[PDB]
Amino acid sequence: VRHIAIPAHRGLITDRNGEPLAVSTPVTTLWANPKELMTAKERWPQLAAALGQDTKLFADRIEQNAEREFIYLVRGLTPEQGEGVIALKVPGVYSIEEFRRFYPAGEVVAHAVGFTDVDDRGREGIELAFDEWLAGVPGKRQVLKDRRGRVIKDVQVTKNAKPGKTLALSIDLRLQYLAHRELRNALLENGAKAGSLVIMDVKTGEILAMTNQPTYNPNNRRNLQPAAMRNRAMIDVFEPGSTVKPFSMSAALASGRWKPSDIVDVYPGTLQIGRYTIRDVSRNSRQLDLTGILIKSSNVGISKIAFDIGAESIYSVMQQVGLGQDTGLGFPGERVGNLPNHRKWPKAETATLAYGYGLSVTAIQLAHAYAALANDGKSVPLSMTRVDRVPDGVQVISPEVASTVQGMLQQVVEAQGGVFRAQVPGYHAAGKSGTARKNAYRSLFAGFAPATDPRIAMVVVIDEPSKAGYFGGLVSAPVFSKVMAGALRLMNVPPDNLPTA
Numbered sequence: 386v387r388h389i390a391i392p393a394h395r396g397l398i399t400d401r402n403g404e405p406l407a408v409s410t411p412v413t414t415l416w417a418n419p420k421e422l423m424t425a426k427e428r429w430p431q432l433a434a435a436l437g438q439d440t441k442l443f444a445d446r447i448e449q450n451a452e453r454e455f456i457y458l459v460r461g462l463t464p465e466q467g468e469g470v471i472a473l474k475v476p477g478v479y480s481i482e483e484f485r486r487f488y489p490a491g492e493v494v495a496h497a498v499g500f501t502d503v504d505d506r507g508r509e510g511i512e513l514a515f516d517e518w519l520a521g522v523p524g525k526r527q528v529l530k531d532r533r534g535r536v537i538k539d540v541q542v543t544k545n546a547k548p549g550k551t552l553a554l555s556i557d558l559r560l561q562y563l564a565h566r567e568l569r570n571a572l573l574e575n576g577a578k579a580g581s582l583v584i585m586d587v588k589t590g591e592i593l594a595m596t597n598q599p600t601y602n603p604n605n606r607r608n609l610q611p612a613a614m615r616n617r618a619m620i621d622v623f624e625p626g627s628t629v630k631p632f633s634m635s636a637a638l639a640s641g642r643w644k645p646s647d648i649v650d651v652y653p654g655t656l657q658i659g660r661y662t663i664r665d666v667s668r669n670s671r672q673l674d675l676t677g678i679l680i681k682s683s684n685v686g687i688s689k690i691a692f693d694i695g696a697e698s699i700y701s702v703m704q705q706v707g708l709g710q711d712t713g714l715g716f717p718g719e720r721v722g723n724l725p726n727h728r729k730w731p732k733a734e735t736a737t738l739a740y741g742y743g744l745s746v747t748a749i750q751l752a753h754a755y756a757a758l759a760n761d762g763k764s765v766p767l768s769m770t771r772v773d774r775v776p777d778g779v780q781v782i783s784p785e786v787a788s789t790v791q792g793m794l795q796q797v798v799e800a801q802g803g804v805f806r807a808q809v810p811g812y813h814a815a816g817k818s819g820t821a822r823k824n825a826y827r828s829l830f831a832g833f834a835p836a837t838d839p840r841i842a843m844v845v846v847i848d849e850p851s852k853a854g855y856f857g858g859l860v861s862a863p864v865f866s867k868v869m870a871g872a873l874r875l876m877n878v879p880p881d882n883l884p885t886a
């Protein structure tokens with residue numbers, strides 16, 4: 386047939402420090418000219434066996450393509466297997482040097498790095514998103530004979546194969562290993578269906594770690610479980626629930642109508658809105674200050690603040706921080722989710738927006754929103770590649786409001802009745818837990834550290850824990866603690882729980 390393509394060397398993927406994540410490995414593809422193969426039928430059984438193929442089934446294949454001038458025998462053999470076939474010296478058997486990807490960290494960064502197809506083209510994750518950058522251009526050599534199939538001359542070798550370009554990801558493999566191990570262990574300890582964990586640099590917008598459970602070995606090109614290949618952190622949507630309350634609180638503080646010391650009466654732990662009932666879990670409260678509403682995670686408390694300030698102000702904070710918004714990461718199949726909106730907000734939708742019931746967001750959007758809040762209200766564009774020059778970013782929340790909300794979230798973790806399991810020994814950590822009824826539950830924790838100068842934002846999402854305790858503060862908060870403690874030390878972040886220096 387017409388023309389053969391010389392596969393280009395696909396670009397190397399590394400983590401932010403140059404540790405290899407996806408490496409192009411030489412493989413040998415064997416093809417044949419059936420016309421010449423017919424001249425050596427006594428060689429076919431040995432050839433069939435060297436290719437693993439059945440003697441009769443292989444002979445059937447060749448005879449069927451007797452007219453064809455080219456056919457593929459086998460693709461992607463190791464250079465050792467490919468040479469064994471060439472050692473047989475079978476007339477009409479030819480070889481082409483192809484490429485296949487090897488993933489040294491395997492299952493650890495599978496979803497982030499991605500996977501390639503049979504033609505070495507990106508199929509998932511980064512491999513897919515930066516395919517054009519990584520692929521380069523195939524080789525151009527005119528296969529010329531006369532009228533047979535025996536390449537008489539290697540004539541015009543013009544614009545030949547151009548190698549693909551190297552790509553350094555934002556991922557730090559050291560933090561990725563830790564995040565992977567801890568999420569894997571929590572899934573097992575909780576008998577959970579799935580999970581996601583995202584670590585972000587609040588200053589640069591870099592994704593330092595992104596792990597999901599279940600995971601798969603991208604080096605094992607058979608079995609391929611589609612559910613295990615899902616990059617849940619970027620493709621699965623969920624109700625963020627109580628994890629959005631810091632954004633409702635940001636709108637309250639920016640309104641001019643609320644201060645942290647203000648009190649909201651949440652008695653009797655229920656609130657009547659038309660034919661709908663807002664309900665708190667622990668209904669043992671009356672007066673709660675704004676920090677108290679977050680510690681007790683009062684849906685009633687947050688809904689009352691929402692009615693006073695208006696849903697517009699809340700929606701705008703949530704929209705500006707990127708919840709239910711396009712991340713601009715350009716990963717095909719990435720889910721945008723939904724942030725409900727109205728011209729005229731009824732009372733029930735105002736409340737559910739405020740406590741995160743009406744919405745669908747991804748783990749990446751949630752971590753990005755928490756990064757804006759942690760970075761004194763400045764949102765920095767999300768990046769899956771190493772950021773050397775930080776873009777300007779947008780001041781979505783005023784520095785004063787974001788700083789107040791950070792202090793309240795520090796109290797959520799440290800105060801009496803708080804999320805003590807999120808505490809990071811040696812540092813001041815801040816965050817908010819979430820528990821969403823899908824009885825099936827989703828356990829959440831979103832936070833950042835150190836509170837003195839936030840460096841890392843983290844989201845821990847545990848899908849369907851199956852033990853007695855399913856609450857976010859019980860299931861996800863310790864994962865945050867464990868991952869945070871290690872990540873801050875791996876990044877040499879100085880401990881900040883110090884004696885008033």
Ligand SMILES: *C(=O)[C@@H](NC(=O)/C(=N\OC(C)(C)C(=O)O)c1csc(N)n1)[C@@H](CNC(=O)NCc1cc(=O)c(O)cn1O)NS(=O)(=O)O
Nearest residue numbers: 624626627666667682741742818819820821822856857858
């Ligand atoms: C925020 O996420 C809140 N969750 C909810 O209100 C939602 N469901 O709540 C549960 C799981 C209890 C339910 O309805 O069965 C929800 C929001 S969006 C969606 N789809 N579902 C708070 C609610 N507070 C809470 O869970 N309290 C924890 C708790 C339980 C307890 O028994 C004691 O003694 C003390 N505490 O604190 N969830 S939270 O995890 O953010 O707090």
